[PDB]
């Protein structure tokens, strides 16, 4: 209301309204949470079918950036695809220049600088994405990071991105997060996603769960969720 | 030092008939005093009425074959119809001059049918000339094969010998005899023979062996 | 390889052989050397096949562009000049090209001579090739300006016959082209041995 | 389809049965109202 | 809407719709495909007696069998004609053959709507293309937006509505040549304003057996006096 | 509404309306329908004309030996992405000497159309791609959007009044999976005959069908191998 | 590379029924000095194809890096699609040709062995881009020495078993140990099947010298 056009200009009270408007763009996006255990990091995304036109296995927001790192994006999908390609490129340069796996702090700092560089100038807009970054290493343990649309990148035990950002972490934080291995945390994330928004505004949603840790020996892939089928036989027991 | 060329050898034949174009070639690929294989056909089937053969340096032959296939698809996917034979000849001449100052060390023979439904053989040189002739022999066994084709196809240097048009099965017996006779004296010729026949009804192929040395 | 050309009262005579060897080995006997640029221009092939073919085809492209932009047919000197300007830009890089340019003009007859060394000159008689000196000799014997048509045909044909009889790098079919006021016209395609039987006595 | 459209649909169907001069409303005319312009246009369609 | 790099809330071309509007002010032209051959006509709209009639170009010569007609803005047509001449010669260079008229007009509409000032403006001309490919005669019509289509008898520019209507009245598929010629100049002297004479209009007819000289020069007088 | 002019500007509700306007520009194309069986993928479009005498503007165009696209919207961007598509096909056909899987090609399409949707100085591409192909795992029917958010389906339909087509696809998507080519194609035109107003009927010259098969090369058909496809029908239930 | 610093030596490969065996030794000689007598000259590519090379060892490290990154990239595409061995062969051929076109060749002699989709594959890539398919490959001096044994047995028996192939490879490596000056009595056998890719350990040879007791 006065000056919020360019991404270079300041306000009479000193903040950039472009960055705020891009931050609350992801607020309308789907709910995506993440949490780590003592030997791994678990992702989970509330994903919704439009009406009946999807195929249940298209456009998966669970990407796979490096051999041990993947994203859990939410927001504008194509911008997240481009950012995932940039992250693949950065891990490519590191693997080509130093001969070992990228530490997640350095990767997150390069990605944060790339996002900040798209927030700086006036020709371009800030990104409309907010994503998660998990990892595991034998000499480092489990690491879960978090990048906002502005470019502030730091670490968590658990997080949530979407509508129910507070309404997930209200009952995320009552989890005994340290003493659990991630194979419990699979159905834990299942119940957390299943709590929020069963039928209220939309009609139907669908669950994806990504999975990295010591049990994959350092690999990162989606769970065989059909194996052990841990949502629904507990989701039907989570309504009471 | 590093030499950019090497002589792989090979022998390609072509005969332009009344309504057919026969292209045949041995499948020996060698280098110096060794044998790399006994199966490498120099012939390539572009369209239903065009067969190209490429001898000389083999890697340039492979590269040139793939580039020709790409431009064939570009003409087809641009203009809703396949190329003629002379159009393919013109295009290859433009390519061979487009790498004038670092030449392909490749002899080229394009056989095929014209738009009248008659045979047409367009020869080449490494630098990019072409012409519509009735018969060519390219490669190492060129000089072992051209004068005999002058004797039989052209009916040259003969007296009171009338000119009969060259039929198909006569051409088949000619090609088999000239490859046996040239494989006896050549070192870059033998172990097989891949005979390609282009008619008005498709492409036929035929595999005839030779001596195994 | 031996070509010649000379203009006179009734247009221009152009003749050539059709042999194109490869070192000591003859490739073909029927190499059409006189490259038909236009329905009013004739270019030749004088040293190198590919170079002459490419640059004359590009010159034909340029001439067709020139006519379609001006609605008026190009002159001969302009075409020879364009060829010399295009050839000069690769001097020292190893181009062999010694072609001739013939055609009809608003001025009438036109005869130019373009080298890969760029020696664009006018004239009345020219002859290029290894055995060109033989053609120069017998042609500058039989040359005049007031010649007839069949006289010029026999002169050029005898000249090319002498050239292929003496030189080793020449032979094949004897082409014979005739440039008129309206357009060029192919005269005949005569073999060497037929001329040997006819002119040996 | 908001009220107005549906109200415009039923009035269209009424006036459609009025076209022939009917005494009743046929689901044909109801479908005609449904499939009327629906306040949608046009198109040109122009290239 | 101000600017070639902004859409509409609905479906407006703007930087192109205003060009399609800018076509309409030009002089008219009528080309008609017939299997005997393609005929074509135009109006010059001569203003002055000093205005020398043979200098105004409407029908130019692209190939020995490919004609043209222009519309509206003069110099965008000059640009497209120059490039079209250059590219057919390139086709003859690399293929020893004639670039067919569909391939000609695709080659024109590769950049007939490719206007970019950064990374210039859209062109302001409608073109009528006639030629004789291997499939016989062809009549072709493009636009500034590159939306190129075949047309059997297309009319452009000013008064093209009644031109199309009265053209669809008389035309069918098995017409002849001269009947279509006089049917065209009837439509012309219903849509022009001045008296039809030797200097107003010009014809351009291409036949498969008469590929050369796609023009009629003052036998057109004899054609006009037969009405 | 004074923020609603360029691609760069985020809205105060976060919805960049240039993307919405490009969507609405896609909504004014011709109707087209693509749907696959387990072994054959068929996409069928609808032709239109400028006048009666003129020919019809074509929609199904060829790309590669196993790739063919439908289209809706602009045609300059259509041919631009066509040339880029053919280029990337012959690029990998040159280098890897294999046919392309479809998913990486459409990812390259999204990455291609990403740049004109984020920087200043290019417009989003008004485009209506319906892509049919064959990787090792059978037919694929993808669709695009000007927002580059490409979708995979089993049967989609885009263009003008394409929603009744979608209802037909809803009530026969279970039935689609089993059948061979012929009744599959006639399900496609039993979507197209509801993409039309009821007072006129689909003729020969206005419809186009392109089949790609697991052993069958991609081939377009027009009126003559479509006269076999147009019989085997009844009238609409009037 | 104009002058090869550290060269390998001959690589042997031959198809059999549903698999390809490749074996090369472990020597890094510089000139005549056997400077690096414990090195690995076979890369086990992801699950189907497999690479072994000769010539400059540094260039092999380079191509190991590039090929590893490309395979990692396609495996991170997550599409379920991999490289066929013939695709690897095509890419490597184009790479060497575009390398040598710039007059800076990679001094190598590479062997690609793969088994995918029922069919085996064994491709050859030269420095000059000369590339073909063969039922048995032999590089360096192996094309002069162990090639006629391969071509004898393939003429004597067109198909093979894995055991016959492995025994024949052992005999050929023994022969190469007998009369190649750039050879060494330590080699590793690598084998692909449908069961995966397997690299055996540093085997050795059993030699004979009973002609030395003669004059």
């Amino acid at each position: 209301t006065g000056y919020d056009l360019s991404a270079s200009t300041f306000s009479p009270d000193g903040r950039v309204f472009q960055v705020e408007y891009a931050m609350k763009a992801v607020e309308n996006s789907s709910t995506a949470i993440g949490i780590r255990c003592k030997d791994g990091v678990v992702f989970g995304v509330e994903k919704l079918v439009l009406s009946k036109l999807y195929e249940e296995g298209s456009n998966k927001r669970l990407f796979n950036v490096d051999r041990h790192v993947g994203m859990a994006v939410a927001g504008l999908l194509a911008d997240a695809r481009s950012l995932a390609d940039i992250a693949r490129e950065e891990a490519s340069n590191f693997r080509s220049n130093f001969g070992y796996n990228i530490p997640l702090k350095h990767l997150a700092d390069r990605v944060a600088m790339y996002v900040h560089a798209y927030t700086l100038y006036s020709a371009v807009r800030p990104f409309g994405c907010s994503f998660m970054l998990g990892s595991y290493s034998v000499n480092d343990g489990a690491q879960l990071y978090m990048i906002d649309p502005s470019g502030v990148s730091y670490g968590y035990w658990g997080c949530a991105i979407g509508k129910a950002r507070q309404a997930a972490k209200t009952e995320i934080e009552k989890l005994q997060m340290k003493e659990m291995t991630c194979r419990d945390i699979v159905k834990e994330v299942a119940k957390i996603i299943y709590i929020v928004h069963d039928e209220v505004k939309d009609k139907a949603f669908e669950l994806e769960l990504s999975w990295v840790g010591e049990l994959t020996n350092g690999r990162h892939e989606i769970v065989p969720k059909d194996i052990r089928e841990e949502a629904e036989k507990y989701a039907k027991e989570s309504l009471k | 030092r590093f030499s950019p060329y090497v002589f792989n050898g090979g022998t390609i034949l072509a005969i332009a008939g009344e309504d057919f174009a026969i292209v045949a070639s041995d499948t020996r690929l060698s280098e110096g005093f060794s044998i790399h294989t006994r199966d490498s056909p120099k012939c390539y089937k572009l369209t239903d009425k065009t067969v190209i053969g490429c001898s000389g340096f083999h890697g340039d032959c492979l590269t040139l074959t793939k580039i020709i296939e790409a431009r064939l698809k570009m003409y087809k996917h641009s203009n809703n119809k396949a190329m003629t034979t002379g159009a393919i000849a013109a295009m290859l001449s433009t390519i061979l001059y487009s790498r004038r100052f670092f030449p392909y060390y490749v002899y080229n023979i394009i056989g095929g049918l014209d738009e009248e439904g008659k045979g047409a053989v367009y020869s080449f040189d490494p630098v990019g000339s072409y012409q519509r002739d009735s018969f060519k022999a390219g490669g190492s066994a060129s000089a072992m094969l051209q004068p005999l084709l002058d004797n039989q196809v052209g009916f040259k240097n003969m007296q009171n010998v009338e000119h009969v048009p060259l039929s198909l099965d006569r051409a088949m017996r000619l090609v088999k005899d000239v490859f046996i006779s040239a494989a006896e004296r050549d070192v870059y010729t033998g172990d097989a023979l891949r005979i390609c026949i282009v008619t008005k009804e498709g492409i036929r192929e035929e595999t005839v062996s030779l001596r195994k040395d | 390889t031996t070509t010649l050309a000379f203009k006179f009262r009734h247009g221009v005579i152009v003749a050539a052989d059709s042999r194109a060897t490869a070192g000591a080995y003859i490739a073909s006997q029927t190499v059409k050397k006189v490259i038909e640029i236009n329905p009013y221009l004739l270019g030749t092939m004088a040293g190198g096949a590919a170079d002459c073919s490419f640059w004359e085809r590009l010159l034909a492209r340029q001439c067709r562009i020139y006519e379609l932009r001006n609605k008026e047919r190009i002159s001969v000197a302009a075409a020879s000049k364009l060829l010399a300007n295009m050839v000069y830009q690769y001097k020292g890089m190893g181009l062999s090209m010694g072609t001739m340019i013939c055609g009809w003009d608003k001025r009438g007859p036109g005869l130019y001579y373009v080298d890969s060394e760029g020696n664009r000159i006018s004239g009345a008689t020219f002859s290029v090739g290894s055995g060109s000196v033989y053609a120069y000799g017998v042609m500058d014997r039989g040359y005049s300006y007031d010649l007839e048509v069949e006289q010029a045909y026999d002169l050029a044909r005898r000249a090319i016959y002498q050239a292929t009889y003496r030189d080793a790098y020449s032979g094949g079919a004897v082409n014979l082209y005739h440039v008129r006021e309206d357009g060029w016209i192919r005269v005949s395609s005569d073999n060497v041995a037929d001329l040997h039987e006819k002119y040996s006595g | 389809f908001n009220g107005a459209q549906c109200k415009a649909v039923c009035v269209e169907a009424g006036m459609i049965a009025l076209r022939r001069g009917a005494t009743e409303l046929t689901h044909e005319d109801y479908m005609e109202g449904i499939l009327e312009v629906q306040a949608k246009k046009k198109a040109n369609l122009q290239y | 809407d101000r600017g070639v790099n902004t859409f509409s809330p609905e479906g407006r071309l703007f930087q192109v719709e205003y060009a399609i509007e800018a076509i309409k002010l030009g002089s008219t032209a009528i080309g008609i495909q017939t299997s005997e051959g393609v005929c074509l006509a135009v109006e010059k709209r001569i203003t002055s007696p000093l205005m020398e009639p043979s200098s105004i170009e409407k029908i130019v010569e692209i190939d020995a069998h490919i004609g043209c007609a222009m519309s509206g803005l003069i110099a965008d047509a000059k640009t497209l004609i120059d490039k079209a001449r250059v590219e057919t010669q390139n086709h003859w260079f690399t293929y020893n053959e004639t670039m067919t008229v569909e391939s000609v007009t695709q080659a024109v509409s590769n950049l007939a709507l490719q206007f970019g000032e950064e990374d210039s403006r859209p062109f302001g001309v409608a073109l009528l293309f006639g030629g004789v490919d291997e499939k016989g005669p062809q009549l072709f019509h493009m636009d500034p937006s590159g939306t190129f289509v075949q047309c059997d008898a297309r009319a452009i520019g000013s008064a093209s509505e009644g031109a199309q209507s009265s053209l669809q009245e008389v035309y069918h598929k098995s017409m002849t040549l001269k009947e279509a010629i006089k049917s065209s100049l009837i439509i012309l002297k219903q849509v022009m304003e001045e008296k039809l004479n030797a200097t107003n209009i010009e014809l351009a007819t291409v036949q498969p057996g008469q590929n050369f000289h796609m023009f009629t020069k003052e036998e057109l007088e004899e054609v006009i006096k037969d009405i | 509404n004074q923020y609603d002019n360029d691609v760069t500007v985020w809205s105060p509700q976060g919805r960049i309306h240039q993307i919405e306007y490009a969507m609405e520009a896609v909504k004014q194309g011709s109707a087209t329908v693509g749907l696959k069986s387990k072994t054959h993928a068929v996409l069928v479009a609808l032709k239109r004309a400028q006048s009666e005498l003129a020919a019809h503007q074509k929609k199904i165009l060829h790309v590669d030996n196993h790739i063919g696209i439908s289209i809706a919207g602009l045609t300059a961007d259509a041919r631009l992405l066509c040339n880029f598509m053919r280029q990337e096909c012959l690029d990998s056909r040159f280098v890897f000497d294999r046919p392309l899987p479809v998913s990486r090609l459409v990812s390259l399409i999204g990455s291609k159309t990403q740049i004109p949707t984020q920087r200043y100085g290019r417009r989003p591409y008004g485009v209506g791609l319906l892509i049919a192909g064959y990787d090792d795992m059978g037919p694929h029917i993808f669709q695009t959007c000007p927002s580059a958010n490409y979708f995979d389906c089993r049967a989609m339909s885009i263009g003008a009044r394409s929603q009744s087509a979608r209802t037909y696809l809803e009530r026969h998507m279970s039935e689609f999976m089993e059948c061979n080519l012929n009744e599959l194609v006639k399900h496609g035109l039993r979507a197209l005959r509801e993409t039309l107003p009821a007072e006129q009927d689909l003729t020969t010259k206005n419809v186009s069908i392109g089949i790609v098969g697991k052993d069958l090369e991609f081939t377009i058909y027009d009126d003559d191998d479509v006269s076999p496809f147009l019989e085997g029908l009844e009238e609409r239930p009037q | 590379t104009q002058n090869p610093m550290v060269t390998g030596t001959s690589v042997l490969g031959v198809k059999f029924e549903g698999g390809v065996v490749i074996a090369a030794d472990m020597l890094g000689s510089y000139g005549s000095l056997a400077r690096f007598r414990n090195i690995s000259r076979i890369m086990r590519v992801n699950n189907s194809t497999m690479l072994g090379a000769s010539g400059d060892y540094a260039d092999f490290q380079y191509l190991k890096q590039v090929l590893g990154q490309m395979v990692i990239d396609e495996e991170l595409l997550g599409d379920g699609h991999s490289y066929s061995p013939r695709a690897i062969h095509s890419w490597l051929t184009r790479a060497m040709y575009s390398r040598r076109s710039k007059m800076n060749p990679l001094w190598n002699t590479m062997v690609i062995g793969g088994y995918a989709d029922g069919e085996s594959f064994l491709g050859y890539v030269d420095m000059l881009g000369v590339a073909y398919e063969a039922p048995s490959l032999a590089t360096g001096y192996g094309a002069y020495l162990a090639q006629p044994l391969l071509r004898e047995v393939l003429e004597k028996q067109p198909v093979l078993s894995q055991t016959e192939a492995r025994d024949l490879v052992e005999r050929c490596m023994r022969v190469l140990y007998y009369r190649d000056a750039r050879s060494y009595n330590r080699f590793q056998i690598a084998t692909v099947t449908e069961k995966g890719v397997e690299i055996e350990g540093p085997l050795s040879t059993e030699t004979n010298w009973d002609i030395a007791h003669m004059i």
Side-chain angles (χ1 to χ4, degrees), chain F residues 94-98 104 135-136, chain G residues 74 77 79 81 83 87 90-91 94:
Chain F
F94 180 76
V95 176
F96 287 150
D97 200 1
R98 70 172 187 265
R104 63 187 67 195
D135 56 359
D136 288 332
Chain G
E74 193 182 7
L77 290 173
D79 56 353
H81 299 286
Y83 293 120
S90 178
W91 183 74
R94 295 295 95 197

mmCIF file of all heavy atoms in Angstrom, chain F residues 94-98 104 135-136, chain G residues 74 77 79 81 83 87 90-91 94:
data_model
loop_
_atom_site.group_PDB
_atom_site.id
_atom_site.type_symbol
_atom_site.label_atom_id
_atom_site.label_comp_id
_atom_site.label_asym_id
_atom_site.label_seq_id
_atom_site.Cartn_x
_atom_site.Cartn_y
_atom_site.Cartn_z
ATOM 1 N N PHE F 94 21.045 -38.944 -31.883
ATOM 2 C CA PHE F 94 22.420 -38.923 -32.351
ATOM 3 C C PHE F 94 23.353 -39.486 -31.297
ATOM 4 O O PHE F 94 24.154 -40.380 -31.580
ATOM 5 C CB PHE F 94 22.827 -37.497 -32.719
ATOM 6 C CG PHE F 94 24.233 -37.384 -33.225
ATOM 7 C CD1 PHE F 94 24.546 -37.788 -34.513
ATOM 8 C CD2 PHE F 94 25.238 -36.865 -32.426
ATOM 9 C CE1 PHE F 94 25.837 -37.686 -34.993
ATOM 10 C CE2 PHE F 94 26.530 -36.762 -32.899
ATOM 11 C CZ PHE F 94 26.830 -37.174 -34.183
ATOM 12 N N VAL F 95 23.264 -38.962 -30.080
ATOM 13 C CA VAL F 95 24.275 -39.249 -29.074
ATOM 14 C C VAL F 95 24.113 -40.660 -28.527
ATOM 15 O O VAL F 95 25.029 -41.484 -28.622
ATOM 16 C CB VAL F 95 24.224 -38.203 -27.952
ATOM 17 C CG1 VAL F 95 25.206 -38.565 -26.869
ATOM 18 C CG2 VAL F 95 24.540 -36.836 -28.514
ATOM 19 N N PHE F 96 22.963 -40.962 -27.946
ATOM 20 C CA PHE F 96 22.824 -42.234 -27.260
ATOM 21 C C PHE F 96 22.439 -43.372 -28.185
ATOM 22 O O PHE F 96 22.544 -44.533 -27.769
ATOM 23 C CB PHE F 96 21.792 -42.092 -26.152
ATOM 24 C CG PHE F 96 22.280 -41.301 -24.988
ATOM 25 C CD1 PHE F 96 21.402 -40.559 -24.223
ATOM 26 C CD2 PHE F 96 23.630 -41.271 -24.673
ATOM 27 C CE1 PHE F 96 21.848 -39.829 -23.143
ATOM 28 C CE2 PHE F 96 24.083 -40.536 -23.596
ATOM 29 C CZ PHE F 96 23.190 -39.815 -22.834
ATOM 30 N N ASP F 97 22.021 -43.054 -29.416
ATOM 31 C CA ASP F 97 21.542 -44.014 -30.414
ATOM 32 C C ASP F 97 20.411 -44.879 -29.859
ATOM 33 O O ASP F 97 20.377 -46.097 -30.029
ATOM 34 C CB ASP F 97 22.696 -44.865 -30.948
ATOM 35 C CG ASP F 97 22.380 -45.506 -32.281
ATOM 36 O OD1 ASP F 97 21.276 -45.273 -32.814
ATOM 37 O OD2 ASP F 97 23.243 -46.238 -32.804
ATOM 38 N N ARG F 98 19.478 -44.233 -29.177
ATOM 39 C CA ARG F 98 18.288 -44.890 -28.672
ATOM 40 C C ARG F 98 17.106 -43.947 -28.816
ATOM 41 O O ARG F 98 17.286 -42.731 -28.932
ATOM 42 C CB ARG F 98 18.468 -45.327 -27.211
ATOM 43 C CG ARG F 98 18.511 -44.195 -26.210
ATOM 44 C CD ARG F 98 18.492 -44.755 -24.797
ATOM 45 N NE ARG F 98 18.357 -43.725 -23.770
ATOM 46 C CZ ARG F 98 19.384 -43.183 -23.126
ATOM 47 N NH1 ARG F 98 20.619 -43.589 -23.389
ATOM 48 N NH2 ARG F 98 19.180 -42.254 -22.204
ATOM 49 N N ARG F 104 11.663 -37.889 -19.460
ATOM 50 C CA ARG F 104 12.777 -36.948 -19.460
ATOM 51 C C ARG F 104 12.615 -35.881 -20.531
ATOM 52 O O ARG F 104 13.029 -34.737 -20.323
ATOM 53 C CB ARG F 104 14.102 -37.694 -19.628
ATOM 54 C CG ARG F 104 14.271 -38.441 -20.939
ATOM 55 C CD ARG F 104 15.536 -39.269 -20.924
ATOM 56 N NE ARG F 104 15.465 -40.356 -19.956
ATOM 57 C CZ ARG F 104 16.522 -41.038 -19.533
ATOM 58 N NH1 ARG F 104 17.732 -40.729 -19.974
ATOM 59 N NH2 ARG F 104 16.374 -42.014 -18.648
ATOM 60 N N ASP F 135 8.121 -45.556 -24.155
ATOM 61 C CA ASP F 135 9.341 -46.016 -23.518
ATOM 62 C C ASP F 135 9.263 -47.540 -23.400
ATOM 63 O O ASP F 135 8.445 -48.182 -24.067
ATOM 64 C CB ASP F 135 9.536 -45.274 -22.193
ATOM 65 C CG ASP F 135 8.351 -45.414 -21.255
ATOM 66 O OD1 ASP F 135 7.344 -46.065 -21.614
ATOM 67 O OD2 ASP F 135 8.422 -44.845 -20.147
ATOM 68 N N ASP F 136 10.121 -48.137 -22.575
ATOM 69 C CA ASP F 136 10.097 -49.581 -22.378
ATOM 70 C C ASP F 136 8.839 -50.059 -21.664
ATOM 71 O O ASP F 136 8.466 -51.227 -21.808
ATOM 72 C CB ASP F 136 11.330 -50.007 -21.585
ATOM 73 C CG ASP F 136 12.598 -49.927 -22.406
ATOM 74 O OD1 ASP F 136 12.505 -50.077 -23.641
ATOM 75 O OD2 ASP F 136 13.678 -49.688 -21.824
ATOM 76 N N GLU G 74 21.505 -40.570 -14.131
ATOM 77 C CA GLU G 74 20.345 -41.298 -14.640
ATOM 78 C C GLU G 74 19.681 -42.114 -13.537
ATOM 79 O O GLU G 74 18.452 -42.234 -13.503
ATOM 80 C CB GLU G 74 20.708 -42.190 -15.824
ATOM 81 C CG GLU G 74 19.443 -42.680 -16.535
ATOM 82 C CD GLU G 74 19.690 -43.602 -17.702
ATOM 83 O OE1 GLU G 74 20.846 -43.994 -17.920
ATOM 84 O OE2 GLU G 74 18.715 -43.937 -18.404
ATOM 85 N N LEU G 77 17.501 -39.882 -11.805
ATOM 86 C CA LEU G 77 16.266 -39.517 -12.484
ATOM 87 C C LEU G 77 15.073 -40.281 -11.926
ATOM 88 O O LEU G 77 13.959 -39.748 -11.899
ATOM 89 C CB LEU G 77 16.391 -39.761 -13.985
ATOM 90 C CG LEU G 77 17.342 -38.791 -14.676
ATOM 91 C CD1 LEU G 77 17.562 -39.187 -16.126
ATOM 92 C CD2 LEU G 77 16.830 -37.366 -14.561
ATOM 93 N N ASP G 79 13.426 -42.829 -13.099
ATOM 94 C CA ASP G 79 12.433 -43.185 -14.101
ATOM 95 C C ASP G 79 12.355 -44.683 -14.341
ATOM 96 O O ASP G 79 11.467 -45.134 -15.071
ATOM 97 C CB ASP G 79 12.720 -42.477 -15.430
ATOM 98 C CG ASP G 79 14.122 -42.751 -15.962
ATOM 99 O OD1 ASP G 79 14.943 -43.387 -15.265
ATOM 100 O OD2 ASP G 79 14.400 -42.330 -17.102
ATOM 101 N N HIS G 81 14.716 -46.218 -15.950
ATOM 102 C CA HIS G 81 15.436 -46.409 -17.196
ATOM 103 C C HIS G 81 16.925 -46.258 -16.933
ATOM 104 O O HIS G 81 17.346 -45.356 -16.203
ATOM 105 C CB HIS G 81 14.956 -45.420 -18.246
ATOM 106 C CG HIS G 81 13.506 -45.575 -18.572
ATOM 107 N ND1 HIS G 81 13.024 -46.624 -19.324
ATOM 108 C CD2 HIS G 81 12.428 -44.835 -18.223
ATOM 109 C CE1 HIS G 81 11.713 -46.514 -19.438
ATOM 110 N NE2 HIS G 81 11.326 -45.437 -18.782
ATOM 111 N N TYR G 83 21.162 -46.979 -18.724
ATOM 112 C CA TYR G 83 21.891 -47.011 -19.980
ATOM 113 C C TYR G 83 22.052 -48.447 -20.444
ATOM 114 O O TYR G 83 22.504 -49.308 -19.682
ATOM 115 C CB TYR G 83 23.281 -46.389 -19.853
ATOM 116 C CG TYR G 83 23.314 -44.911 -19.581
ATOM 117 C CD1 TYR G 83 23.912 -44.419 -18.428
ATOM 118 C CD2 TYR G 83 22.825 -44.000 -20.509
ATOM 119 C CE1 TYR G 83 23.967 -43.067 -18.171
ATOM 120 C CE2 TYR G 83 22.870 -42.641 -20.260
ATOM 121 C CZ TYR G 83 23.447 -42.183 -19.092
ATOM 122 O OH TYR G 83 23.508 -40.837 -18.834
ATOM 123 N N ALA G 87 24.371 -47.985 -25.622
ATOM 124 C CA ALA G 87 24.298 -46.537 -25.449
ATOM 125 C C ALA G 87 25.595 -45.986 -24.883
ATOM 126 O O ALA G 87 26.059 -44.916 -25.297
ATOM 127 C CB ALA G 87 23.128 -46.169 -24.540
ATOM 128 N N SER G 90 28.019 -46.006 -27.669
ATOM 129 C CA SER G 90 27.783 -44.892 -28.576
ATOM 130 C C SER G 90 28.298 -43.580 -28.004
ATOM 131 O O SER G 90 28.956 -42.808 -28.715
ATOM 132 C CB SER G 90 26.289 -44.777 -28.871
ATOM 133 O OG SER G 90 26.019 -43.679 -29.722
ATOM 134 N N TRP G 91 27.998 -43.317 -26.725
ATOM 135 C CA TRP G 91 28.453 -42.088 -26.082
ATOM 136 C C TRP G 91 29.968 -42.019 -26.033
ATOM 137 O O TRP G 91 30.560 -40.964 -26.284
ATOM 138 C CB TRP G 91 27.922 -41.979 -24.659
ATOM 139 C CG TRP G 91 28.336 -40.684 -24.045
ATOM 140 C CD1 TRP G 91 27.826 -39.458 -24.320
ATOM 141 C CD2 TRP G 91 29.452 -40.466 -23.180
ATOM 142 N NE1 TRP G 91 28.494 -38.494 -23.612
ATOM 143 C CE2 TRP G 91 29.509 -39.086 -22.913
ATOM 144 C CE3 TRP G 91 30.396 -41.306 -22.586
ATOM 145 C CZ2 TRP G 91 30.464 -38.529 -22.073
ATOM 146 C CZ3 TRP G 91 31.343 -40.749 -21.756
ATOM 147 C CH2 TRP G 91 31.369 -39.376 -21.500
ATOM 148 N N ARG G 94 31.368 -41.311 -29.570
ATOM 149 C CA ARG G 94 31.214 -39.899 -29.913
ATOM 150 C C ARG G 94 32.170 -39.027 -29.116
ATOM 151 O O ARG G 94 32.704 -38.041 -29.638
ATOM 152 C CB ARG G 94 29.769 -39.456 -29.700
ATOM 153 C CG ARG G 94 28.758 -40.126 -30.621
ATOM 154 C CD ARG G 94 28.996 -39.752 -32.074
ATOM 155 N NE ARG G 94 29.805 -40.717 -32.809
ATOM 156 C CZ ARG G 94 30.402 -40.435 -33.960
ATOM 157 N NH1 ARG G 94 30.279 -39.225 -34.476
ATOM 158 N NH2 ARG G 94 31.126 -41.349 -34.588
#
